[PDB]
Amino acid sequence: LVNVNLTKEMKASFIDYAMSVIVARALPDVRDGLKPVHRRILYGMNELGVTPDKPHKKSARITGDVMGKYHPHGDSSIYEAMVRMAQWWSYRYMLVDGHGNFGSMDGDSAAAQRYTEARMSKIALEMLRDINKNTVDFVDNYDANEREPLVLPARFPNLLVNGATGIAVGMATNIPPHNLGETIDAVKLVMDNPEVTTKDLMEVLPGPDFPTGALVMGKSGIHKAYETGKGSIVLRSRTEIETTKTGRERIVVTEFPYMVNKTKVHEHIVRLVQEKRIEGITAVRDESNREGVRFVIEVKRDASANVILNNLFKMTQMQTNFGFNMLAIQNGIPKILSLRQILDAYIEHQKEVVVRRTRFDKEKAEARAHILEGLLIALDHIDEVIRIIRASETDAEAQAELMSKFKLSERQSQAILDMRLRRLTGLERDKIQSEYDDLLALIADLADILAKPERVSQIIKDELDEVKRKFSDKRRTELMV
Amino acid sequence: LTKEMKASFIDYAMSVIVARALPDVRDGLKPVHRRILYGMNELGVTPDKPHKKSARITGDVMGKYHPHGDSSIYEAMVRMAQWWSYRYMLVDGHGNFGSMDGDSAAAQRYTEARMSKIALEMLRDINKNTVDFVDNYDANEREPLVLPARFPNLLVNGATGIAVGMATNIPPHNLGETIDAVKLVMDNPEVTTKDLMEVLPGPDFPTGALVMGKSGIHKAYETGKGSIVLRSRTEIETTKTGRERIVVTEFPYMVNKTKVHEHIVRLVQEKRIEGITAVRDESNREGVRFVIEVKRDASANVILNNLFKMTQMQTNFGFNMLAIQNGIPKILSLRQILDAYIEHQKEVVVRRTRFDKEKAEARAHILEGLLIALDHIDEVIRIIRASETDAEAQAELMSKFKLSERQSQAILDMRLRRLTGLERDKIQSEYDDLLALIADLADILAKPERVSQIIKDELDEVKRKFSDKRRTELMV
Amino acid sequence: GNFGSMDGDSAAAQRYTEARMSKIALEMLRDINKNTVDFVDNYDANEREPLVLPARFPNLLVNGATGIAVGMATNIPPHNLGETIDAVKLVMDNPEVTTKDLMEVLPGPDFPTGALVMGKSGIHKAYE
């Protein structure tokens, strides 16, 4: 069978086994927290240029395209994450704009692979634009040729606020979600104020949010989990007693906390009927739910319906003991972070992002500056260089005489030599001079941004406010003590 | 009314006859086959690349024109692959085409073909405005009504017409014999029919036969009417047991072996010579082994004359020998094919000369502007520095020297690489070369015999490239 | 598909041209093995085409014809089939019958819509 005798290669293959199973499935990353397959989806959708501006497209074709541009990995988790980042209700924020059959929230994952027709959302335009942006190393695949980026850089801790699902690999962890607006607020307060305290930002930060809209009670678990990320908290559904025209009372729920089925709990209600461990209950009904979710339990008189609500949030799954585990990974090794340290690593990432983008733009401007330096030096002593080309013979003689007379490089000399008559009007000569000084002003501006670091902070805050303007984030949940 | 009905009769009869009856004198190439070769040249894919297996070619053909069947277009393809019927050669192909056997190759697109070697030089000079064009009914692409030629294929491949008024037999001939006939009529406008007997000893076949007559050939090349003998080859050899064995290789043309053999079996089996149960007619993939053995107490020659009376081993092959030119049919003789091909090639060469003068004098005008630019430069530079517009620069150049608009703008098309003096001498050298070639073409245009010499040049080109002998062994 | 019923709207949906035939060609012609009709050859003169349509049936006598504007005009007006079979079989078993006694067998020239016919002098002229 095995007959493998060398324990050393067993240990080495076992370390690669463990770390590769880590790297494969979902991890608390530095910059996106995502699966690498998510990164694959995003980078393929970007570099194919499939915008939401353009119309819809059959997406299983795109799935096979990305699968063929990448490794021959299995289709299952691919199509799974394809659905998951198109599910509007599960992830708090919108990524993939599907068009087909999914199942709403009640245990029917419709998997119509033929009908896989979709687009994306407009938030990847805020997520990543690294076309020219020297940011991230690449790994090569098909006989080691074609790029794949290591990480997903951004200007945005959105995926902090999204939430994570990486549990069964080694030890368990997740990321519970918040909303974005007060996140922007507390972040900018740390930006302009690098020496703030936790609880004063808890004054800025409400509870961990949920897309359905949850009733939150208690803050001791909030105190523990904003610090150390461990603990379960209690969650209740928006549930009311309503009187009829007859005086009969009605238990009316609006939503539920996270990871709840209507139908499994409904079967559990029918159990509780036939289990004969709860009384009073008459009608278990649910209709018209697509204009708005409306599930109604209706109970006879002389029953103490609020005590029955107490019995619901004691024994039924309507009560939620929602636990946290945010056990981080920063450059491979597992860690654990406070809410400050997350944003700190975000800050220094934005530092490196804007610095490297500015240096790429710097080298753009420097190269074009040397171009226009050569142009203006050609404009200096024109007829002498006319005599030069009327005299000399070769590339070597021309470059030697131009370097002796004007101290320029070879490419500069040849770009001089590539000047035609139709770029010899004094109009375009002074337009060269004008755009030359324009780029000089841009170089000086970027050097001034290199002088002081806080301009980066200010521009980040500006475009955070732009995103919060285009993406107003009202609340949906409710916190109590 | 009835005059308009007569107009419809005349015009529609012209449509049908020019459609599917005899082609022009100028090409000898039927317009179906003409468009086959034109679209296969406009495939562009060389015969050097391996020849294709597709009906996409014929789909573009049917997009070019709607017939009463593209299966007939494929029939035209296959009948131009019939080397055993139509001579050398118009198809570079691979697929099933059979022989003169009764073969049915239903695999239509599954055959391979592309351009052929003779077609390559046969249809050059499209890029020289030599031949006129007409638009299709589809109003999108054009087509030529005639073709340029490098030989009278009229004589190379014959004609087997249909009787719309009457059909037409035209026999094939030989390559180099036709070349010698061209040279003969070129050197002498005073040739005779015996001269034609010299440079053409006789019409030949891709298979071979025997033509015993002489004056039928004489009336064929003079009157255009007459019938000949087509005879099978006969070889009388000795069986080891004493039988006058008959070996046959050649045959009359358009004569399958199969039904002839069946009628021979019938004539045996109708109370006649029945002891000839010896018909060894096989192994014909090396050649033709059509061997019988005459029975004992019977001579071979009587059975030979009886099968000549069966009109299949000796056949009166007639000739109608008609043609189409200037919208009319015509009874044929030589100095008509001959002078027609001569003056057609005159048209082609002279119009090619005119087009080459067009290109050469245009480029000469360019290099005029180039050398006049390279005379004096820096003053033009400094006056350009006193300007800000290419229209102003054009007006400045018109004030400076005599140029064209194209010349002025091409002088504007000068980077700093253009500012040397060696390339001045190079442009001057090619300028004098081009002036010398223009004067050469003008002197050739003031030379009638030089055209004939160019015709001799192309004849010697195709003669060094190819030749063919008389495979059809003819005794008279 | 789409045709238009009888009121001047010839629907010509060439894309929608989806069809079958009727079961009467099984009575019309079965010449597979049947040495009946010469053939003419087309694409470089190879493939068959029959000269005529033989049958066992004068059905197309009873159908009707439309050949008018070519030279002079002619048609074939239709009958029905049953009394046609009757009068034909009477001529078969009786080769020396008269016209009007078969007009006793043959009603007027028929029409598919169902027409009111008056008069028989034109019937006398046109059957002759």
Author numbering:
A (entry chain B): 6 to 486
B (entry chain A): 11 to 486
C (entry chain D): 105 to 232
The authors write:
DNA gyrases are type IIA topoisomerases found in bacteria, archaea, and some eukaryotes (plants [Evans-Roberts et al., 2016] and plasmodial parasites [Dar et al., 2007]) and are capable of relaxing positive supercoils and introducing negative supercoils into DNA as well as performing other topological manipulations. Unlike eukaryotic type IIA enzymes, which are large homodimers, gyrase is an A2B2 heterotetramer formed by two GyrA and two GyrB subunits. The GyrA dimer forms two gates that facilitate DNA passage. Here we present two different oligomeric structures of Streptococcus pneumoniae GyrA-ΔCTD forming an open dimer complex with a 44 bp unbroken DNA oligonucleotide.
